[PDB]
């Protein structure tokens, strides 16, 4: 299928490219320290008028 | 240095309106629950009203409920105290005090600890 022929003459041909595939998935990020103070708004004891 | 300046005093005939204003300078105005406390002439203190960090008032005194109206403004660091139905009895000094515990600094939110006190005005009413 590479030479586009049926009979193939003797030799050494190059056909394709051996390649390894990825295995899984990785995501990275440093330790998270800041969280938005939503509780102070949502859990506030008294809302404004 | 922390500064609590109040203004609005002056004799007004009974049946009029008054709008005291307290200015705060020297701290984060949004992490401290303000208070308004009166001071009768030659008598003890008497709590009037207050406001939490989030512009939510915490009720007024039993004998004053119905006329006073407090309002806060964190943008200008200004607290205001609208007053209605003025009467001869409503003559006293007025301090605006601040809480001590910052919000979420440790159960519930703090409201106690009136530590810093400004020099009060001399509101008086006469016919």
UniProtKB/Swiss-Prot annotation, chain A:
Region called Disordered, residue ranges: 19-35
List of glycosylated residues: 23, 25, 31, 43
Domain of life: Viruses
Effect the entry attributes to changing residue 46 to T: In strain: Omicron/BQ.1.1, Omicron/XBB.1.5, Omicron/EG.5.1
Subunit structure of this chain's protein: Binds to host ACE2. RBD also interacts with the N-linked glycan on 'Asn-90' of ACE2. Cleavage of S generates a polybasic C-terminal sequence on S1 that binds to host Neuropilin-1 (NRP1) and Neuropilin-2 (NRP2) receptors. Interacts with host integrin alpha-5/beta-1 (ITGA5:ITGB1) and with ACE2 in complex with integrin alpha-5/beta-1 (ITGA5:ITGB1). May interact via cytoplasmic c-terminus with M protein. May interact (via N-terminus) with host bilirubin and biliverdin, thereby preventing antibody binding to the SARS-CoV-2 spike NTD via an allosteric mechanism.
Protein's job: Attaches the virion to the cell membrane by interacting with host receptor, initiating the infection. The major receptor is host ACE2. When S2/S2' has been cleaved, binding to the receptor triggers direct fusion at the cell membrane. When S2/S2' has not been cleaved, binding to the receptor results in internalization of the virus by endocytosis using host TFRC and GRM2 and leading to fusion of the virion membrane with the host endosomal membrane. Alternatively, may use NRP1/NRP2 and integrin as entry receptors.
Protein name: Spike protein S1
The species this protein was found in: Severe acute respiratory syndrome coronavirus 2
Whole-protein coverage range: 301 to 349 of 1273
């Amino acid at each position: 299928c590479t030479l586009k022929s049926f009979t193939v003459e003797k030799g050494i041909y190059q056909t394709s490219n051996f390649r390894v595939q990825p295995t899984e998935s990785i995501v990275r990020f440093p330790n998270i320290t800041n969280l938005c103070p939503f509780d102070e708004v949502f859990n506030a004891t008294r809302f404004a008028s | 240095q922390v500064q609590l300046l109040e203004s609005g005093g002056g004799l007004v005939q009974p049946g009029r309106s008054l709008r005291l204003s307290c200015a705060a300078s020297g701290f984060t105005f949004d992490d401290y629950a303000m208070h308004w406390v009166r001071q009768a002439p030659g008598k003890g203190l008497e709590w009037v009203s207050g406001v939490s960090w989030n512009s939510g008032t915490i009720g007024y005194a039993d004998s004053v409920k119905g006329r006073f109206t407090i309002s806060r403004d964190n943008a200008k660091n200004s607290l205001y105290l609208h007053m209605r139905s003025l009467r001869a009895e409503d003559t006293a000094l007025y301090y605006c005090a601040k809480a001590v515990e910052m919000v979420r600094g440790l159960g519930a939110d703090p409201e106690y600890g009136m530590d810093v006190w400004g020099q009060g005005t001399t509101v008086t009413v006469s016919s």
